[PDB]
Design a protein around this ligand. Structure first.
Ligand SMILES: [Zn+2]
Ligand SMILES: [Zn+2]
Ligand SMILES: [Zn+2]
Lengths: 90, 271, 353, 345
């Protein structure tokens, strides 16, 4: 019937999470806020700016929260494996 | 019964070839059918969007004709516009990936007439249907930011803070790299309102206080931010955090202009 | 030659519902195929497929013995493996166990010398999977006996497949003692590249064994790994290791919401996991009124499996303890009956706590 | 360049040719490659060109002996470590997962209304593959329904995941029903769309094809050039040499009705084609002087705080900086803790 008919298609795709990150699971605050401890004490430090820190597992906590957590424990809060910095920035 | 037009709609679909010359002929016929009194007007437009989404029409004149069809709806009275808008979205639904641009424009138009009629719940639902992430087309960042704020604002006026917070969370991922200064100001106004709605009064007070120092906004809007900051600080939870903010508000000279300043000065002096 | 491609393409171009007509048209193909070629492999596959449709059972097994002469060097290993995997798969849906059973014994005879190490390994492992779903625990043991004399590293990947098979086998037998030994037996291998479903059975049993033993900080990470791998590949058991991950997180003294990672957030509103996500939100930010109400409502989703009903007594006590600690923080002298009201327990049990 | 050459050797070895080496000798030559591999002083660079070579090998299904691929990465993992082969392990697992995914999708198709074409897709993964969506493309009307179907299958199975299709790396097969005989050609998605545009009419201009497929100028020009090389699209002036013909958006290219190529398996889808280190060292030594004893993770965090705000350095570069500073006897490891540094000036 049709002049040209397609019989086989071999596509390639890329799956990604719909929400990259929506909450810092340490202070329970949102990613763009000032990490709770650095929220109440609104003076400086925000200069350093609570830029998020991405681990190897790509979990993306606040840098203040993850650094404060790393002082005693060396395990990621969620997957409970070794924590290793991989990325830093927005 | 006067339906002597619908027959040639299907007849032209099965012609020898569709070109640009025939596309312009539809304008003349459409321009007279629109200029009609009653139900006879509705039938012509209803079948126009039915016989166009068909596979028999190539997607080279169909896309151009669909956006031209939708651009003539705002001139049409909104009572009929609501009915036709729902129908075309249902007919495009089987094949959405092809018309990933016409759907967005139609839902924006439908939401605009819904909000003007004071229906916040239904207007918000329409704007959700727009695929802004799960689509093949990459939209502009300012477009996604603007749409998210509209959804959050409509949910706030619906008194549904849980849904409004979710969409303002999606909008806060694009502020840092966005370049529209007005859009950044507009986001913080909606974010502060969301925090106030969620009964996070002390956090909203900080945002309102910072927003009150913006030289971009007008003087009248600057005082409105200060008024909301004063009310939120008073309504917040007493403690070390709230007491520190109370001292900051007392230093402000503009705080004396409000009728709720006497209460502010008593709570400042531990009265 | 170009003629070989044209001859093969003509046969598939015709639907040829009439049988025995293509057979004379493949004698041409074999004569035209002088050297070893990939087109010969495809020709044999098609005639087996066509003949199989109109029964005639004694035909496929004769051509199949000719077929393993192509896996040697005629074609690649991906193509040959895919052909075998596809053929054995879609014929099992039609039941017909006897025809499939006679095939496995005959293929093993010649495949044992054509492709020795890897293809025979995966065919044997697939055969073991058939025995498990039909629950025939009377002949799977001899297969594992053969696999016993296969290692004696550099063979870590193959070792994980059989170890996972044994764990899935003994799990149905409720053999907890052998499960602990098996889980440690697989922990030594650390240079393998397994499918993300093999590392979803040894990891799940590791979390389960930790739960029974009494460790709650090791079950949390094991169940997270089991859920992560089950989520990527597969489906059914995904919403069982997430529920166990939640339980293994509340028994660990909680902290950090389990439904905040990227993997677990989409399933937080699942109709099956709605009971558990409400439980965590009540456990953290301790409040007894909402926590008990959830337990009372759901007798069909929480107090059913032994892994939650047995560990529900360790809970309902950690939350009461944490409520007690926070309540008595500002007081210096507090009545015990007052504590009883705030904990919804009688006076006698408050003193014991 | 020698590492690159060794890796291209690896590529041949595993890829695919007319002759397939036996599984016994395939690992034998792989062992020899690992004999020289440990002699290589720099290991980081080898993974750089091995990632893109492997990705092209697997995404096109051009790999030979995928079992040998698993053992190859298995040998690498125990050689340098997990971190060195973590990215490549993701690539192999994505192929295995998607192969299982295809089998379930076919079963789902039978229980519902079947499609009209044999559809297979490799899902891959975002963040681990060098590929990225770079060319805009309009989905053909014939390849849309199946598209939507698969999306549904990927929405009921996996929730919260969004697909980003890569039409640049997607191939396919197209049958013909108007030639002298029944042909079956193989072409990419772009060529398939261009050739399916001619389904309803005879001749189109270049602009009429650009505005119908929404492909960008350079890729569209290259695709038209290769299609003209296959003499499938014939220009008005036959005697003009195709290579030197200058293409403009006014030529009326028409489908060659009288195509009479002898081969019925025409394959027209043939492939084409220092200062910062000193800054990191200075930051590390300053942080070590400020904090006399530190852990590796805390040192990494401090370096990211002080210095990464400027140019966002890569973590392996910082690790190499730590190693070279250790060699310069600027900071020493402490016994009893594997990851602990003390500033020994
Ligand atoms: Zn935080
Ligand atoms: Zn902070
Ligand atoms: Zn983690």
């Amino acid at each position: 019937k049709k002049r040209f008919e397609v019989k086989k298609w071999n596509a390639v795709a890329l799956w990604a999470w719909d929400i990259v990150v929506d909450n810092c699971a340490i202070c329970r605050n949102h990613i763009m806020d000032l990490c709770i401890e650095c929220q109440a004490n609104q003076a400086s430090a925000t200069s350093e700016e609570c830029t998020v820190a991405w681990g190897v597992c790509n979990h993306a906590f606040h840098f203040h929260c993850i650094s404060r957590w790393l002082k005693t424990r060396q395990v990621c809060p969620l997957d409970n494996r070794e924590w290793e910095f991989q990325k830093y920035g927005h | 019964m006067a339906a002597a037009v619908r027959q040639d709609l299907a007849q032209l679909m099965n012609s020898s070839g569709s070109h640009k010359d025939l596309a312009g002929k539809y304008r003349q016929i459409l321009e007279k059918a629109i200029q009609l009194s009653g139900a006879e007007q509705l039938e012509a437009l209803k079948a126009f969007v039915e016989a166009m989404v068909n596979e028999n029409v190539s997607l080279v004149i169909s896309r151009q004709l669909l956006t031209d069809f939708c651009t003539h709806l705002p001139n049409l009275p909104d009572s009929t516009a609501k009915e036709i808008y729902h129908f075309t979205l249902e007919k495009i639904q089987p094949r959405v990936i092809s018309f990933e641009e016409q759907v967005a424009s139609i839902r924006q138009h439908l939401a605009s007439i819904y909000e003007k009629e004071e229906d916040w719940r239904n207007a918000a639902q329409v704007l959700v249907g727009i695929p802004l992430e799960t689509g093949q087309k990459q939209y502009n960042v300012d477009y996604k930011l603007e749409t998210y704020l509209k959804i959050a604002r409509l949910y706030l006026e619906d008194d549904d803070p849980v849904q409004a917070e979710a969409y303002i969370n999606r909008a806060s991922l694009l502020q840092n790299e966005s370049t529209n200064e007005q859009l950044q100001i507009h986001y913080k106004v909606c974010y502060a309102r969301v925090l106030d709605y969620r009964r996070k009064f002390i956090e909203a007070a900080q945002r309102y206080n910072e927003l009150s120092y913006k030289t971009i906004v007008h003087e009248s809007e600057r005082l409105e931010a200060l008024k909301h900051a004063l009310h939120c600080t008073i309504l917040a939870s007493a403690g070390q955090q709230r007491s520190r903010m109370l001292a900051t508000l007392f230093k402000d000279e503009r705080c004396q202009q409000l009728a709720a300043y006497g209460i502010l000065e008593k709570m400042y002096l531990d009265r | 030659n170009v003629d070989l491609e044209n001859q093969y393409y003509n046969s598939k171009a015709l639907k040829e519902d009439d049988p025995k007509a293509a057979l004379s048209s493949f004698q041409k193909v074999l004569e035209l195929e002088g050297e070893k070629g990939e087109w010969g492999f495809k020709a044999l596959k098609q005639m087996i497929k066509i003949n199989f449709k109109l029964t005639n059972f004694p035909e496929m097994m004769n051509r199949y013995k000719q077929l393993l002469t192509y896996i040697r060097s005629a074609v690649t290993r991906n193509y040959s493996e895919k052909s075998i995997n596809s053929i054995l798969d879609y014929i099992s849906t039609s039941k017909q166990m006897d025809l499939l059973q006679e095939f496995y014994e005959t293929t093993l005879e010649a495949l044992k010398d054509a492709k020795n190490d890897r293809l025979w390994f995966k065919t044997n492992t697939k055969l073991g999977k058939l025995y498990l779903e039909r629950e025939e625990y009377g002949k799977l043991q001899k297969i594992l006996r053969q696999l016993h004399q296969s290692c004696q590293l550099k063979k870590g990947t193959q070792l994980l497949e059989i170890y996972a098979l044994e764990i899935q086998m003994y799990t149905a037998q409720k053999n907890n003692k052998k499960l602990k030994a098996l889980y440690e037996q697989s922990l030594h291998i650390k240079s393998a590249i397994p499918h993300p479903l093999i590392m979803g059975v040894i990891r799940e049993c590791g979390g389960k064994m930790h739960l029974r033993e009494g460790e709650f900080e090791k079950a949390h990470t094991d169940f997270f790994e089991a859920f992560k791998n089950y989520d990527e590949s597969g489906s059914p058991r995904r919403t069982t290791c997430l529920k166990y991950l939640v339980l293994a997180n509340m028994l660990m003294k909680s902290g950090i919401n389990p439904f905040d990672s990227q993997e677990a957030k989409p399933y937080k509103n699942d109709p099956e996991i709605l009971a558990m996500t409400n439980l965590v939100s009540a456990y953290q930010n301790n409040d007894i009124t909402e926590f008990e109400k959830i337990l009372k409502t759901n007798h069909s989703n929480i107090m059913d499996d032994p892994f939650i009903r047995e560990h529900i007594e360790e809970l309902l006590r950690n939350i009461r303890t944490q409520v007690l600690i926070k309540l008595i923080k500002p007081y210096t002298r507090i009545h015990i009956p007052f504590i009883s009201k705030e904990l919804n327990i009688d006076v006698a049990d408050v003193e014991s706590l | 360049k020698s590492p690159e050459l060794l890796a291209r050797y690896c590529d041949s070895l595993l890829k695919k040719s007319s002759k397939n080496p036996e599984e016994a000798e395939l690992e034998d030559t792989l062992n020899q490659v690992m004999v020289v591999f440990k002699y290589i002083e720099d290991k980081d660079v080898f993974q750089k060109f091995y990632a893109k070579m492997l990705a092209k090998r697997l995404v096109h299904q051009n790999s030979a002996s995928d079992d040998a691929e698993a053992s190859m990465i298995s040998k690498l993992k125990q050689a340098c470590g997990f971190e060195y082969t973590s990215k490549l392990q993701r690539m192999f697992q994505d192929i295995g997962v998607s192969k299982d995914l295809n089998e379930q999708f076919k079963k789902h198709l039978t229980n519902s209304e079947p499609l009209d074409l044999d559809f297979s897709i490799q899902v891959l993964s975002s963040g681990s593959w060098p590929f990225q969506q770079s060319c805009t493309f309009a989905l053909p009307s014939e390849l849309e329904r199946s598209y939507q179907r698969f999306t549904a299958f990927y929405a009921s199975r996996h929730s919260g995941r969004k697909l980003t299709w890569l039409y640049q790396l997607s191939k396919g097969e197209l049958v013909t029903n108007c030639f002298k005989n029944r042909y079956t050609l193989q072409a990419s998605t772009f060529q398939m769309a261009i050739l399916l545009q001619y389904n309803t009419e005879d001749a189109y201009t270049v602009q009429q094809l650009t505005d119908s497929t929404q492909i960008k100028m350079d890729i569209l020009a290259q695709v038209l050039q290769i299609l003209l090389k296959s003499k499938l699209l014939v220009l008005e002036d036959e005697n003009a040499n195709v290579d030197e013909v200058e293409l403009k958006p006014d030529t009326l290219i028409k489908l060659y009705l009288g195509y009479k190529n002898k081969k019925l398996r025409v394959n027209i889808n043939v492939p084409m084609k220092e200062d910062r280190k000193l800054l990191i060292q200075a930051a590390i030594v300053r942080i070590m002087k400020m904090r006399k004893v530190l852990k590796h993770q805390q040192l990494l965090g401090e370096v990211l705080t002080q210095l990464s705000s400027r140019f966002k350095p890569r973590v392996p570069v910082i690790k190499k900086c730590i190693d070279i500073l250790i060699e310069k006897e600027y900071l020493e490891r402490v016994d009893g803790e594997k990851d602990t540094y003390s500033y020994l000036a």
